[PDB]
Amino acid sequence: AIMHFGNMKFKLKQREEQAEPDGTEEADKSAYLMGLNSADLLKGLCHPRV
Amino acid sequence: KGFPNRILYGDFRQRYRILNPAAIPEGQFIDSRKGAEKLLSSLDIDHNQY
Amino acid sequence: ASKIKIEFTPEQIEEFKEAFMLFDRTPKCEMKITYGQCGDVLRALGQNPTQAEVLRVLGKPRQEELNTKMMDFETFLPMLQHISKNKDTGTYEDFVEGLRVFDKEGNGTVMGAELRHVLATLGERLTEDEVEKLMAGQEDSNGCINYEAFVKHIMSS
């Protein structure tokens, strides 16, 4: 999972200074390796709920 | 006319896996699109809907 | 109600008859056996009959028909074997997937009280004391029943 985290790809959603997952396959890999939820992980990274 | 209901691949997998648990084996691979497509193709419904 | 289709080795029939005599509550009328509680033995015979199914295998018996009147199991024996060979049951992974949605945190466990409630109320009718003795030991400190281990223990034993 550590070496998979380097494959994360993020792009501006609608050129609105907001990050969205450009690629999700490596995100799916990272989520499965810890047994996490890929959608939840991507939402957390793209949008931190402080 | 359009498609009103839109559901994420991972959410769909974790929600409707009970329909065909044989598809998408428990922790034996990492893929979202392929697993969801197999699950839907095993649901014997109008495949032109989605 | 059922026709003679498949028969296994007679020693299997012999040990089924022996278990029935174990359950036979008729001292002199040993030929006849309980009409309704034979499904309980079918439960004890390595099978899992659902309520509706264990009813219409007997042709929708009434409560007086279930308990007062007697019956000869050996007529039902082909139908018992048919029920065994239907394999109208899910798999262990299927069971854990089905009970997984009955959770709100995804910790690999299910809270005990709601599990007892759904076992007694949501599903087929069952007395509570049965459910507490079912997850007796499986019950833990915080109630988070290990549903995977619990169901594998159930179907295996």
Which method, experimentally, gave rise to this model?
Answer: cryo-EM
B18/C98 CB distance under 8 A: yes
Whether C93 sits inside 8 A of B21 (CB atoms) is yes
Q: Where are the beta strands (DSSP E) in A1-50?
A: 9-12, 19-23
Provide long-range contacts, Cβ within 8 A and 24+ apart, for A20-23: A20/A46, A21/A45, A21/A46
Task: Closest CB to B10: pick one of A25, A29, A37.
Answer: A37
Nearest chain A CA: its distance from B41 CA (Å): 21
Contacts of A29 in chain B (CB under 8 A): 30
The whole-angstrom separation of Cα C154 and Cα C157 is 5
Q: Alpha helices, DSSP H only, in chain C?
A: 10-23, 38-44, 51-56, 63-67, 73-86, 92-100, 112-117, 128-134, 147-156
**Interface check B34 vs C, CB under 8 A:** no
Could A25 and B31 be called an inter-chain contact, meaning their C-beta atoms sit closer than 8 Å? yes
Which residues on chain C are in Cβ contact (under 8 Å) with B15?
101
| CB of C71 closer than 8 Å to CB of C79 | no
Buried b / exposed e along A15-39 (16+ C-beta atoms within 10 A): eeeeeebeebbbbbbbbbeeebbbb
What residues of B are in contact with residue C101 (Cβ under 8 Å)?
Answer: 15, 18
d(CA C16, CA C18) in angstroms, rounded, equals 5
**Residue given tokens 């030929």 in the structure block:** C31
